[PDB]
Automatic annotation (TrEMBL), chains A, B:
<dbReference type="InterPro" id="IPR000600">
    <property type="entry name" value="ROK"/>
</dbReference>
<protein>
    <submittedName>
        <fullName>Glucokinase</fullName>
        <ecNumber>2.7.1.2</ecNumber>
        <ecNumber>2.7.1.85</ecNumber>
    </submittedName>
</protein>
<comment type="similarity">
    <text>Belongs to the ROK (NagC/XylR) family.</text>
</comment>
<dbReference type="InterPro" id="IPR043129">
    <property type="entry name" value="ATPase_NBD"/>
</dbReference>
<dbReference type="GO" id="GO:0047700">
    <property type="term" value="F:beta-glucoside kinase activity"/>
</dbReference>
<dbReference type="GO" id="GO:0004340">
    <property type="term" value="F:glucokinase activity"/>
</dbReference>
<dbReference type="Pfam" id="PF00480">
    <property type="entry name" value="ROK"/>
</dbReference>
<keyword id="KW-0418">Kinase</keyword>
<keyword id="KW-0808">Transferase</keyword>
Length: 286, 286
């Protein structure tokens, strides 16, 4: 059986066909429209009809992963930031009703975690994933196997942790990847915008790069400590583009989590996600 | 059918028999031994054998609620404070093996929440309870019924939230009841060191009492805001001795949660617990 997977992001819409054996075919990736003159829902419908034509599918199972706050049972966007305008109220089940009655919708961090966990073997039972990007997302897979999305579909909006009144910043406004980029630029990293150059510069011993990274990692670690004492997970995953840095990201963050926890507190191992691109495409089918 | 319920505290050991219709009989209240000359394990064995004789029970169902860190499946004290010396390694299942194979063991905040939830009808699927006392305890009951205790049985240690390096305090060191008593002294409330007199004075219009309460409630609300964006619960209960203040406690805390959340964020209703004494005795059977 062939499955259609679509992952709707702020900047990109990824899609692919997956078979019963999890082989991935016809991976496609386009720019997310402005959702004003050209509609996200039109792109989604074009992708589904495209694959249905190409694979001669009738009533395909379709999985949709999307940014924003998602009501999974309704298959509807409950809320979206102004990043994606006019997005609230978008109902993918209604949109594709003429093509298939088998449409599943998930928010993007939940789908990514479901995919990460389907494709990998982990020792821990309870796994929290924090995704660093424009903002910070969170998802938790619990002792009994499930991801709870909250009473109002707002579980684990961890970017909103640790509001500092004097500075008027949230966790994600200090600790997202976008915040690290702003801190680099203000620190004189002006020729390359790219976050990996900061890590390479630090690896070579450049003190200013190390100081920017450690100060930011300190703010990241503060957020992780809050998640630690609530969830007591067996493993904490860090995802998002910056997670391609692997242990070079972890070594800055992991030792500093201790700074916000009681003396000798044993906290969970911290690692980067392993599947970097496809995770939500697999997860949105689960 | 008769169940034996035992609640082991820092100062008291509560006990009772509960029947099929949740009627409570033969409530007993003794002082916790020093666990040096006379052993807690011996008192529990005595309580269980006493009730078995009196009610002519053979292999009774026994529920045990206890302070400290509890491995519910081993039925074992994983860690205990200095309050109760020598407690770690106590295994109530091994201790009572000769009397019954039906022994359940739970930590005291989890038991109290389960009892609170069995005896009442609430308007929410996901319920967090925060217990204010010497320190602050926490417990969370899920969308799917059960309580996740964490990978090392240390879930929901809300007292460790929000460590501030400059002030060297955790959440509970600012926001627990014992902290309010310290803040009464620091704030100039020379009338009394009793918490109910602080509230009385505030109701009478005392500006110093009002200021101590608002500043303290500000700190309480900061912690509730963190729990809110992680769990997105449908209801937050406040328990502990101070929760006797009912609406007069809630009215200081509830509106301040908004201060640590994004503009127009819709957060859970906040109420005080309803069962004041017996909850863990009911809960340890659940």
């Amino acid at each position: 059986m062939y499955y259609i997977a679509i992952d709707i992001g702020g900047t990109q819409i990824k899609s692919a066909v997956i078979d019963k054996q999890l082989n991935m075919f016809d991976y496609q990736q386009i720019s997310t429209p402005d959702n004003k003159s050209e509609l996200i829902t039109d792109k989604v419908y074009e992708i589904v009809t495209g694959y249905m034509k190409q694979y001669q599918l009738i009533q395909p199972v379709i999985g949709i992963s999307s940014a924003g706050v998602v009501d999974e049972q309704k298959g509807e966007i409950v809320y979206a930031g102004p990043t994606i305008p006019n997005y609230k109220g978008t109902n993918f089940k209604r949109l594709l009703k003429s093509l298939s009655p088998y449409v599943k919708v998930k928010n993007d961090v939940n789908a990514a975690l479901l995919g990460e966990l389907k494709l990998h073997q982990y020792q821990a039972e309870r796994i929290f994933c924090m995704t660093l990007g424009t903002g910070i997302g969170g998802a938790y897979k619990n002792n009994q196997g499930h991801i709870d999305n909250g009473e109002l579909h707002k579980a684990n909006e961890v970017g909103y942790l640790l509001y500092r009144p004097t500075e008027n910043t949230t966790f994600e406004q200090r600790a997202a990847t976008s915040a690290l980029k702003k801190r680099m630029i203000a620190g004189g990293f002006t020729r390359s915008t790219h976050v990996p150059v900061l890590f390479e510069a630090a690896e070579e011993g450049d003190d200013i790069a190390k100081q920017i990274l450690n100060e930011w990692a300190e703010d990241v670690a503060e957020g992780i400590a809050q998640i630690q004492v609530m969830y007591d997970p067996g493993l904490i995953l860090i995802g998002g583009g910056i997670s391609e840095q692997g242990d070079n990201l972890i070594k800055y963050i992991e030792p500093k989590v201790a700074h916000y926890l009681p003396k000798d507190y044993v906290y969970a191992p911290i690692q980067t996600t392993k599947s970097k691109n496809d995770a939500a495409l697999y997860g949105c089918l689960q």
